[PDB]
Amino acid sequence: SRDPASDQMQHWKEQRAAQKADVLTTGAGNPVGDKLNVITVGPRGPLLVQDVVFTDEMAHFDRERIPERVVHAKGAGAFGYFEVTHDITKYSKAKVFEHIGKKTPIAVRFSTVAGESGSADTVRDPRGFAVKFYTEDGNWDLVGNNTPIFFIRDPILFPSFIHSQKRNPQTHLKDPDMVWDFWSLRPESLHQVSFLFSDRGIPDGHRHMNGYGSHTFKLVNANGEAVYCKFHYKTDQGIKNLSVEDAARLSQEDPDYGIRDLFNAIATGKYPSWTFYIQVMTFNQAETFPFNPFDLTKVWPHKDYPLIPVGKLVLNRNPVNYFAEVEQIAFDPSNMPPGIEASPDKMLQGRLFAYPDTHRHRLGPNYLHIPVNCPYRARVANYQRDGPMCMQDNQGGAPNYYPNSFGAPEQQPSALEHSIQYSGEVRRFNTANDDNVTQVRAFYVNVLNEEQRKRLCENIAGHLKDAQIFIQKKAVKNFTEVHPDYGSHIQALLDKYNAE
Amino acid sequence: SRDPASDQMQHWKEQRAAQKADVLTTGAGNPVGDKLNVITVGPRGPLLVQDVVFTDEMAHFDRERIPERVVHAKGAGAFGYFEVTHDITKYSKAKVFEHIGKKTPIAVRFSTVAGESGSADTVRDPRGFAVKFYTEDGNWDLVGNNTPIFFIRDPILFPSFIHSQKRNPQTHLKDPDMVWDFWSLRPESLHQVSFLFSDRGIPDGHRHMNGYGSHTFKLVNANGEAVYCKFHYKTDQGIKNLSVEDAARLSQEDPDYGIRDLFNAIATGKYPSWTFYIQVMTFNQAETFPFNPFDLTKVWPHKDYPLIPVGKLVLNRNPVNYFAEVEQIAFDPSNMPPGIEASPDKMLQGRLFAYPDTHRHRLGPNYLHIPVNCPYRARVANYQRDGPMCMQDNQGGAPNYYPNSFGAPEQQPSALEHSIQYSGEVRRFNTANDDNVTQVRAFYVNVLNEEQRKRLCENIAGHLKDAQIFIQKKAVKNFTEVHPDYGSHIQALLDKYNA
Amino acid sequence: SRDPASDQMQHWKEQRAAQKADVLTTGAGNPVGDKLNVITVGPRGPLLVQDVVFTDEMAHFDRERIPERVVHAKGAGAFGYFEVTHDITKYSKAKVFEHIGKKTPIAVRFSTVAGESGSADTVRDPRGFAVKFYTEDGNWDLVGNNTPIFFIRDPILFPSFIHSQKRNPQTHLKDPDMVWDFWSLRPESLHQVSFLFSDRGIPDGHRHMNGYGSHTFKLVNANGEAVYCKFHYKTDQGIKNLSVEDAARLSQEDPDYGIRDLFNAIATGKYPSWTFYIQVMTFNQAETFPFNPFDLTKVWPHKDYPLIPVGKLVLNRNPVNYFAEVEQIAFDPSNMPPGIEASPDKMLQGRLFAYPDTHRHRLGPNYLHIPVNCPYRARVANYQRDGPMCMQDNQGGAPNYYPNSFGAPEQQPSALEHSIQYSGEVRRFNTANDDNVTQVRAFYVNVLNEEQRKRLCENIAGHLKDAQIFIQKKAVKNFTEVHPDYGSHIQALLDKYNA
Amino acid sequence: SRDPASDQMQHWKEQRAAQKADVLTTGAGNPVGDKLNVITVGPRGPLLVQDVVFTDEMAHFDRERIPERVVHAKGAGAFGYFEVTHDITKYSKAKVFEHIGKKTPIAVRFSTVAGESGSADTVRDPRGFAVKFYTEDGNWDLVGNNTPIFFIRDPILFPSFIHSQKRNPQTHLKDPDMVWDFWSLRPESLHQVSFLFSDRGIPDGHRHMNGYGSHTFKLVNANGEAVYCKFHYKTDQGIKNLSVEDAARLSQEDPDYGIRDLFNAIATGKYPSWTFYIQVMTFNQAETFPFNPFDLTKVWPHKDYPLIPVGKLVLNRNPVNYFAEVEQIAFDPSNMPPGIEASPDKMLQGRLFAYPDTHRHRLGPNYLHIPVNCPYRARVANYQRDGPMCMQDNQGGAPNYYPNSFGAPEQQPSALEHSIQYSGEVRRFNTANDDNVTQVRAFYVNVLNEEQRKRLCENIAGHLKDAQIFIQKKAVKNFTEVHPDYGSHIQALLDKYNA
Ligand code: HEM
């Protein structure tokens, strides 16, 4: 008897008490007489095409892999439910918040960012925290990170930013030169960078980290009244991080540390919890705000905008088949039921398209048919048909054009989006200098203390030292802008490494 | 009011008595407030990405199409069942023939060959007749034509043959030069060609034609006793053909004539029936045979090898969704359950690979998950895992390696194939001159009569006339070899057009 | 002898003078000893996997097909060039209009709409006229129709519209009930419908018809000044249309009529020509305009906005390989270089996404790498990388992020788009009643005459008759709205067939 | 300053002396005015679809990934050439061995086995060593490992094996239970296992390990004379392995150790070298052979079958774009030009299908079009056409069927394969007990010494200990068979960890 995660097979066999083994068939259901030997003419003769038992299995085996997530490749999954503990209907009408005590099945997948499919879990990198709500009014995907902000505030830079974080095109190796060249050119990433290289940079598992929606969403109540908000879910298991020494060791001792940890916790009745809160901001305050409420590189102070309890997030069920329930799960930020809408956030606007579009590539056009993704707690009925690998009945033989005089599904005028009044030219408004220091300075100071500030600079210089000097300079100048000590301290550390 | 096929929508609505209209939702299940208008900034402003309702619908619509079958593109489908009427267990042990009265669900798809997705039904071209059996011991796919023979007897020429029958690479139009060049170079196709251009060349619907497995298959009884055979299923609706004049008209009047014809039949309780027969040849007669018993360009005479009743084939249900139940159904000749095996037939040997292979591209690696294809009458339990669009539970968390000491599915020693002894060199044995006239002559003479003979020659000349002269010559030479009158009669008609 | 199209193979062979035949290799380049026979153990033995020559060919053959266009499936292509004859640089700064006498290689593909890959050419249906300009400032695609307007003015209905125009979900047969139920619910379709069922409904070939960009575009000169416009290209061969009878016959006699006709013309130095014109409208008139200048269901009168000659369109080259140069060619209405931009036109706004989106599914994510589609007359240099089937050098080992301090490509501030001021709410503005009879009436009256009016109603009634009475009424109510005579005349004809 | 590998971007910038930066364009070649800001209505307004610049870049970025190799995912690549140093023409007629001094361009990709794309290099696992020769007679792919043998000898077990080597279906974590349960059930794996857990198990880079073809191949000379053989390429840099402690540290310090190490070597004119040898066995000795000459779990003793020098392998060129030149390169063992053929080896037989098949899925049906894969030193001319992403001219408008009378490519009777006479029943001959200890016992003793023995038993026990007891027992049992001391020693170590 070892950890539950190790006795998977042992427990699976223990479930089959007196039941005899199933009959080994092919793909079509035909039984196999011998699957341990290939057909040949003579004991030492060639293999003939006749062996359809071989090909069948082989062929499929040849198609086991699928393209990995362009980002957030390495991750882990689990299931549970979401419970409403407080009434916040005066803000949103969403069926998911209907009444207290209302439980809604959910799905969650944690992950890293730049790391590829075989990468290690315990490494400095933001964390992925996506939640899928199977509500009556359709599925609701809340794709969030473990940090309330981000490096850039314009989607048009994302493809590049990520490129910089990955491997070099020619060498296929991590390139500090790329990582900092971009960062040193986009001083807006300062905030997030400070947060990334801090202690929260390497959480001690998926259960010891918080979660935020990150972007600014919009909420609408049964009276068409709208208000902005931010989603936050605090770990009831406490915030815990691994030291640079431990993460590095575990990095190779157990690359799937995060995976194992989560699985064993659940398998042993140690179901992980998270508390759901929302920060509210009326339209009025939205203006008075000293910054761009929709600037992903900014946060909403808890003093002027306190968190409001909403419910609880609980994970009490591991997946049965990783590939089918995790690797295949897809979250779409556009999946928002009535009561929840988007906002003028550029990064959010650009995300409304990237995901569904990429899913049609990674999984397929009809990826919403795969169980995990299928909105079973709803009733899909529209005018879409066909597509490769079309499961179900393709909606049978119902009219496939709207409108029509034959009782086919109709639109519901109560599901209408909220309307806002905008005005101005239609152009590319430069947001490069939307103040990339203030909020950062307040963080380096008040938020952190001596120890942290020291460790932080250390963490940074340890990495930034491996870049060219001309890049090192730019970065420091940006850091100095945040605070004179923030810059110098790093400079001092670099001089040491640069020395020898 | 009108034919049931025309009142589809009307009947669908009629089925919804008091029921109210379902709520229109996006793909994720989210309800729509208005699907008749896109979101814009101002009544005359641009469109914004925010409208996911629009993109959701559009995006999917942009991915409705899938690659059509490389062959037998235009077809029709229907469902029914197979019923055993006579006991033939002394030949095969297949669970499908188990006991008399045993009914097994089946699927059928009729089709043409060269014609693309938008082609017309009533056209001179072989007909496709595939039957999928959902038996306990797995799915059984009997893919067959409406003709007992074929043009070539070697798979390595199929790709070319089909090419010659399709459009020209540069112009994209049917090229008579291509069609006859290949045929004039492969006299073995004479048999099938003679069949093709005869009256049966254009059946009057899919219900008035017979079906054959064509290939020589092997049967294995409960005692490891093997014997060869050939499947035949006769139309209980009689054999009817359309005249050149009629087929031409219908070719444009109603291109989907076949589809509509079948659909209304079933819809009107006029369920089509087919009688199942099998020709048995023992291993002994297998040698005595004057030809190659596995030669696809040769038939088994009903005199020496009479048909043996097996059962009935009935189609009593139209598909609910064409794309889902028909355009997506896949048939694999490899799908043969215990009791039925393949044979040394080259053309079939090459067919054992091509289908499953082509299916993984047309539909996908896990196409066997698509309902119509999934062998629901059996229990799939192996060590295959993953693959794009993986439905089901991927077999859950069960051992994924054989062997193993954890109770995973095991092989069944009783499903072992039948063993045969072979011997000789492993090379490319030329089968180009395996006699391409003997049976063909006996066809042109005894099988047909004055009228048919005349019409046939006419049908041929009418087509071959559009090809180059030097090609015409070669073809005539090959016909003359079948029968002196066969050729000359053609040559005569040709001179007229050519003149 | 015969037409150049029929003697394809012949001329190809004639091109190989004393040149000996190339050596037949496999896929990887290895020579083939015999491709006419498969490998087996003994003459009558089974086939073995060893024969990779067989599999290599067979497999590929099993993957020849690819999803056909979701719309405008059946088409024909040709190549030529565009030449500027008049100076309009005072309107647009586009490099393609740079100076008079400037020639720019082009690509063109004609098509139908609902008809699948196998359908016939000579059929009542709007025609597709796309043009690809291989300019220095990138490729510019001018995806147009043979009609200046369309059935609907909102993209969110298109999916549905094309659905109704196609096959029934269950029967898979054209369904008049759908076709008219939709049209009868969207009176905005009247205009185009009236045009479609007119004599221009079935052009005699692709060379005897006009083309228009249909949508309203925006033009910007070297001084940031922008004006709206509409593209029209008239056939220098004249407007010719086949009669109902003729088209019907040809619909089956030669389903590739349009393909054959165009190929031969080019083949015999009868290079088809079209003249390029443009309708200009300043921002001022854009307001005064009694209608919505961006309403695809409207037209700009020639009296108020005359056509202005710009250049000539010449097709002087047939494709060498249909599949490679035509079936694979992709047009993106989004591909507009500096000097030409989009407009508030909802229909056009939605198209900006639909095309590139579907191309990545039909052909692949790197379809811009396919020769015909690649913008060879320009230098592609960005930060995009990887992707399935990545041809070229994936841009070598260059910085793949922007910005950077390493010399990678930089943005050109001279290629900025034109900025326009907007304002208002962001919602779905209902544009279902933007007047659907005023211009339509002006067409039925002044545009046509006695004959055409008679023929039109005839054409319509002949079709709308096969629909359900309750549906028949609706349509008529709509036609009566356009003109009392328009509706009644149809009504009269209907009562006849309904009898 | 730093290693060449780190100063990539720097050196690329250096190459661009006085040249200005290229113009940043979209996919279609259209220039971009600002790629640092998305278009929105007002500074804080929503984003609109008009931003094709955004969508273009975005959409593509969304399709950057492609399925990774099912096996050997984490690897490195490089280019160089092969040079014949010795004459062996008396054995094979392959154009690559033509004459001494003949240089042929080659491609190489080294790799691990179970580890995924992001895994670490310095890990205990066999090493991938594939070579692609761009010969005149087509491409020749010699796909080999760093070990001369393998765990299993029948391909039908491969899928399972690899399954056991990877992650658990439920937990997704390596499962020592799976790894050993299979291994303990297939005693034939012993040989390879012993090698894997020896010091050669974790090579210090790709340049310090040897390469073998592993399988038994057949050679044919100009006079149809055939002999069997084995391929071996020793490293001219000597064999060097990292310690368990060292590999463990590098395993996290630099997971791309192997990639980096190789790149730099080449970048600093330290071009790695490998010598090519072959082991010949006539048909006669093939029989007298105490074992099955085609048993992949056996090796050919250098005393009875000495290495024969053939040439030199050199790698003098790094890739420019990893994705394009390395991640996309595909090696097909089937690719073997005249002179080199396969053998009855079951493991090889099954590989003749697996690769070309898996490639058609991972890259595409026309993957042989991607440069690195295209056989540029040969002329591809066959009868294959179409296929998704069809680059080139699809062979233009040439006859697409065989045979034909128009000068299309023709087969070369001199490229016919070598024929062998086989005899016996066609069934699944069990090969589970083909002696799994003899050659292993010889390895454990004479091959290794005290140190190695101890270190091997150590390395094994270190891993085998994390498996269930019952599994531990079976393993030891198998080990004991090899040699009493082999098993006991392991039993000893085990007892300690177990207690
Ligand atoms: C908003 C409505 C429309 C939508 C969403 C739409 C969508 C499409 C799509 C998805 C394709 C398939 C592209 C491919 O796979 O190659 C297509 C092709 C085509 N469409 Fe439309 N279309 C619309 C309106 C029109 C109109 C009004 C015209 C003419 C101005 C037109 C002319 C064509 C032509 C010529 C093609 C063939 C281009 C090619 O082969 O790539 N379409 N359309």
Compute the distance between CA of residue C191 and CA of residue C483 in angstroms, rounded to an integer: 12
- Spell out which residues of chain D touch residue C138, defining contact as CB-CB under 8 Å: 25-26, 28-31
Q: Which helix (H) or strand (E) holds D497?
A: helix D484-498
Compute the distance between CA of residue D67 and CA of residue A64 in angstroms, rounded to an integer: 9
Query: Any idea what DSSP says for residue D496?
Result: H
SS3 A235: strand
**Technique used to solve these coordinates:** X-ray
Compute the distance between CA of residue C488 and CA of residue D157 in angstroms, rounded to an integer: 77
Residue type (1 letter), A475: A
Return the biggest CA–CA distance within chain D: 86
Would you call the peptide bond into A403 cis, given omega within 30 degrees of 0 as the criterion? Answer: yes
SS3 A80: strand
The resolution in angstroms reads 2.8
Ligand 1: centre distance to CA C143 (Å): 7
CA distance D339 to chain B (A): 16
Query: Any idea what DSSP says for residue A320?
Result: S
Compute the distance between CA of residue B108 and CA of residue B124 in angstroms, rounded to an integer: 21
Residue type (1 letter), B318: N
β-pair type (A138-145, D273-281):
unpaired
**All residues at 6 or more sequence positions from B364 whose CB lies less than 8 Å from its CB, including other chains:** A364, A388, A389, B387, B388, B389
Ligand 1 site-directed mutation target among C110, C196, C355, C367, most atoms within 8 Å of CB? C355
CA distance C448 to chain D (A): 38
SS3 A41: strand
Compute the distance between CA of residue B374 and CA of residue A27 in angstroms, rounded to an integer: 9
Give the residue from A213, A247, A217, A252 showing the smallest Cα distance to A231. A213
Q: Which fold has domain C150-200+436-499?
A: Hemocyanin, N-terminal domain (1.20.1370)
Q: Which strands form A40-41's sheet, in the order they lie side by side? A: A40-41, D421-427, B421-427, C40-41
Residue with tokens 């044919």, as numbered in its chain: D220
Query: Any idea what DSSP says for residue D67?
Result: P
Binding site members of A for heme: 355
**Closest Cα to atom 17 of ligand 1:** C71
SS3 A423: strand
Judged by a CB distance cut-off of 8 A, whether residue C185 touches chain A is yes
SS3 D376: coil
Compute the distance between CA of residue B386 and CA of residue B404 in angstroms, rounded to an integer: 19
SS3 D490: helix
Ligand 1: centre distance to CA A369 (Å): 28
Structure tokens at D17: 């002396």
Judged by a CB distance cut-off of 8 A, whether residue B475 touches chain D is no
- Do the annotations mark residue D477 as ligand-binding? no
Query: Any idea what DSSP says for residue A223?
Result: T
CA C386 to chain centre: 29
Structure tokens at D323: 């994705």
Compute the distance between CA of residue D293 and CA of residue D297 in angstroms, rounded to an integer: 10
Query: Any idea what DSSP says for residue D157?
Result: G
Structure tokens at C316: 């002087």
**Residue A180 contacts residue D9 (beta carbons within 8 Å):** no
CA A272 to chain centre: 18
Terminus-to-terminus CA distance in chain C, angstroms?
Answer: 52
Query: Any idea what DSSP says for residue D381?
Result: -
- Spell out which residues of chain C touch residue B468, defining contact as CB-CB under 8 Å: 10
Compute the distance between CA of residue D50 and CA of residue D43 in angstroms, rounded to an integer: 16
Compute the distance between CA of residue A478 and CA of residue A474 in angstroms, rounded to an integer: 6
Give the residue from A395, A111, C255, C374 showing the smallest Cα distance to B251. C255
**Residue B97 contacts residue B310 (beta carbons within 8 Å):** yes
Compute the distance between CA of residue A370 and CA of residue A363 in angstroms, rounded to an integer: 9
- Does A46 contact C47 at a Cβ distance shorter than 8 Å? no
Query: Which among A116, A169, A346 has CB closest to D118?
Result: A116
**All residues at 6 or more sequence positions from D93 whose CB lies less than 8 Å from its CB, including other chains:** D220, D221, D222, D338, D339
Looking at the CA of residue C214, tell me the nearest atom of ligand 1.
Answer: 30
Which string of b and e fits B154-180 if b means at least 16 CB within 10 Å? bbbbbbbbbbbbbbbbbbbbbbbbbbb
The structural architecture, per CATH, of the domain A150-200+436-500 is Up-down Bundle (1.20)
**All residues at 6 or more sequence positions from A210 whose CB lies less than 8 Å from its CB, including other chains:** A146, A232, A233, A234, A235, A239, A274
Neighbours of A285 (CB within 10 A): 15
- Do the annotations mark residue C65 as ligand-binding? no
- Does D34 contact C334 at a Cβ distance shorter than 8 Å? no
Compute the distance between CA of residue B37 and CA of residue B31 in angstroms, rounded to an integer: 15
Residues of chain B with CATH 4.10.91.20: 1-65
Give the residue from D128, D153, D126, D147 showing the smallest Cα distance to D297. D153
Structure tokens at A255: 């690359």
| Per-residue H/E/C for chain B | CCCCCCCHHHHHHHHCCCCCCCECECCCCCECCCCCCCCEECCCCCEECCCHHHHHHHHHHCCCCCCCCCCCCCEEEEEEEEEECCCCCCCCCCCCCCCCCCEEEEEEEEECCCCCCCCCCCCCCCCEEEEEEEECCEEEEEEEECCCCCCCCCHHHHHHHHHHHCECCCCCCECHHHHHHHHHHCHHHHHHHHHHCCHHHCECCCCCCCEECCCCEEEECCCCCEEEEEEEEEECCCCCECCHHHHHHHHHHCCCHHHHHHHHHHHCCCCCEEEEEEEEECCCHHHHCCCCCCCCCCCCCCCCCCEEEEEEEEEEECCCCHHHHHHCCCCCCCCCCCCEECCCCHHHHHHHHHHHHHHHHHCCCCHHHCCCCCCCCCCCCCCCCCCCCCCCCCCCCCCCCCCCCCCCCECCHHHCCCCCEEEEEEECCCCCCCCCCHHHHHHHHHHCCHHHHHHHHHHHHHHHCCCCHHHHHHHHHHHHHHCHHHHHHHHHHHHHHHC
- Does B390 contact A25 at a Cβ distance shorter than 8 Å? no
Residue type (1 letter), A105: P
Assigned CATH for A1-65:
4.10.91.20
Beta bridge partners of C277: C232, C309
Terminus-to-terminus CA distance in chain B, angstroms?
Answer: 53
Looking at the CA of residue C145, tell me the nearest atom of ligand 1.
Answer: 29
Compute the distance between CA of residue C422 and CA of residue A300 in angstroms, rounded to an integer: 30
Query: Any idea what DSSP says for residue D132?
Result: E
Judged by a CB distance cut-off of 8 A, whether residue C424 touches chain A is yes
Judged by a CB distance cut-off of 8 A, whether residue C3 touches chain D is no
Looking at the CA of residue C129, tell me the nearest atom of ligand 1.
Answer: 35
Chains that touch A (3 or more CB pairs under 8 A): B, C, D
* Minimum Cα–Cα distance from B321: chain A residue: A396
- Does B426 contact D419 at a Cβ distance shorter than 8 Å? yes
Residue with tokens 């095969």, as numbered in its chain: B92
Structure tokens at D157: 């077990």
- Spell out which residues of chain C touch residue D367, defining contact as CB-CB under 8 Å: 389
- Do the annotations mark residue C198 as ligand-binding? yes
Looking at the CA of residue C332, tell me the nearest atom of ligand 1.
Answer: 41
**Closest Cα to atom 19 of ligand 1:** C72
Structure tokens at D162: 């690899």
Compute the distance between CA of residue B154 and CA of residue B143 in angstroms, rounded to an integer: 18
How many residues appear in chain B?
499
Give the residue from D164, D196, D157 showing the smallest Cα distance to D182. D164
Neighbours of B451 (CB within 10 A): 9
Compute the distance between CA of residue B254 and CA of residue B303 in angstroms, rounded to an integer: 41
Looking at the CA of residue C75, tell me the nearest atom of ligand 1.
Answer: 40
| Per-residue H/E/C for chain C | CCCCCCCHHHHHHHHCCCCCCCECECCCCCECCCCCCCCEECCCCCEECCCHHHHHHHHHHCCCCCCCCCCCCCEEEEEEEEEECCCCCCCCCCHHHCCCCCEEEEEEEEECCCCCCCCCCCCCCCCEEEEEEEECCEEEECCEECCCCCCCCCHHHHHHHHHHHCECCCCCCECHHHHHHHHHHCHHHHHHHHHHCCHHHCECCCCCCCEECCCCEEEECCCCCEEEEEEEEEECCCCCECCHHHHHHHHHHCCCHHHHHHHHHHHCCCCCEEEEEEEEECHHHHHHCCCCCCCCCCCCCCCCCCEEEEEEEEEEECCCCHHHHHHCCCCCCCCCCCCEECCCCHHHHHHHHHHHHHHHHHCCCCHHHCCCCCCCCCCCCCCCCCCCCCCCCCCCCCCCCCCCCCCCCECCCCCCCCCCEEEEEEECCCCCCCCCCHHHHHHHHHHCCHHHHHHHHHHHHHHHCCCCHHHHHHHHHHHHHHCHHHHHHHHHHHHHHHC
Ligand 1: centre distance to CA C347 (Å): 11
Residue type (1 letter), C236: D
Residue type (1 letter), D26: T
- Do the annotations mark residue B355 as ligand-binding? yes
Query: Any idea what DSSP says for residue D486?
Result: H
Q: Angle CA(B212)–CA(B217)–CA(B222) in degrees, nearest 5?
A: 125
Handedness of CA C424, C427, C428, C432 (dihedral sign): negative
Chain C contacts in chain A segment 345-404 (CB below 8 A)? 357, 360-361, 365, 383-385, 394-404
**Residue C81 contacts residue C132 (beta carbons within 8 Å):** no
Residues in contact with ligand 1 by the CB-under-6-Å rule are B 62; C 69-72, 109, 111, 128, 130, 143-145, 150, 155, 158, 214, 330-331, 347, 350-351, 354-355, 358-359, 362
Compute the distance between CA of residue C383 and CA of residue C394 in angstroms, rounded to an integer: 10
**Residue B79 contacts residue B88 (beta carbons within 8 Å):** no
Q: Angle CA(B224)–CA(B230)–CA(B233) in degrees, nearest 5?
A: 125
Crossing angle of the two packed helices A469-482 and A484-499, in degrees rounded to 10:
160
- D322 half-sphere exposure, CB direction, 13 A CA radius: 18
Query: Any idea what DSSP says for residue A164?
Result: H
How far are the Cα atoms of C278, C352, D34, D230 from residue C344, in angstroms, in the given order? 19, 12, 22, 70
* Alpha helices per DSSP H over A271-387: 283-288, 322, 346-362
Which string of b and e fits A477-497 if b means at least 16 CB within 10 Å? ebbbbbbeebbebbbebbeee
Ligand 1: centre distance to CA A308 (Å): 50
Query: Which among A379, A383, A385 has CB closest to B323?
Result: A385
Strands (DSSP E) contained in A112-242 are 128-135, 138-145, 211-212, 217-220, 226-235
Q: Angle CA(A385)–CA(A391)–CA(A393) in degrees, nearest 5?
A: 65
Query: Which among D159, D365, D400 has CB closest to B383?
Result: D159
Residue type (1 letter), D456: L
Query: Any idea what DSSP says for residue D446?
Result: I
Give the residue from C332, C296, C327, C417 showing the smallest Cα distance to C140. C332
**φ/ψ (deg, to 5) at D210:** -95, 170
Compute the distance between CA of residue A300 and CA of residue A212 in angstroms, rounded to an integer: 12
Give the residue from B64, B66, B145, B75 showing the smallest Cα distance to B115. B75
Residues of C known to be catalytic:
72, 145
Structure tokens at C22: 């190339």
How far are the Cα atoms of A359, D191, D467 from residue D474, in angstroms, in the given order? 46, 16, 11
**Residue C278 contacts residue C339 (beta carbons within 8 Å):** no
- Spell out which residues of chain A touch residue B31, defining contact as CB-CB under 8 Å: 137-138, 337-338, 412, 414-415
**Residue C374 contacts residue D25 (beta carbons within 8 Å):** no
Judged by a CB distance cut-off of 8 A, whether residue B182 touches chain D is yes
Q: Angle CA(B43)–CA(B47)–CA(B53) in degrees, nearest 5?
A: 110
- Do the annotations mark residue C240 as ligand-binding? no
Residues of A known to be catalytic:
72, 145
- Does B328 contact A380 at a Cβ distance shorter than 8 Å? no
Please report the number of interchain residue pairs, chain A to chain B, with beta-carbon separation below 8 angstroms: 352
Numbers of helices and strands, H then E, in chain D: 13, 12
Residue with tokens 């490069």, as numbered in its chain: A432
Beta bridge partners of A76: A110
Compute the distance between CA of residue C116 and CA of residue C123 in angstroms, rounded to an integer: 12
Residue type (1 letter), A441: R
Compute the distance between CA of residue A125 and CA of residue C62 in angstroms, rounded to an integer: 45
CA distance C240 to chain A (A): 34
CA distance B34 to chain A (A): 6
Q: Which helix (H) or strand (E) holds A81?
A: strand A75-84
Compute the distance between CA of residue D177 and CA of residue D182 in angstroms, rounded to an integer: 9
Structure tokens at D208: 């310090």
Residues of chain D with CATH 2.40.180.10: 66-149+201-374
Compute the distance between CA of residue C252 and CA of residue D313 in angstroms, rounded to an integer: 63
How many residues appear in chain A?
500
- Spell out which residues of chain C touch residue D387, defining contact as CB-CB under 8 Å: 60, 63-64, 66
Assigned CATH for A66-149+201-374:
2.40.180.10
Residue with tokens 């593109």, as numbered in its chain: B73
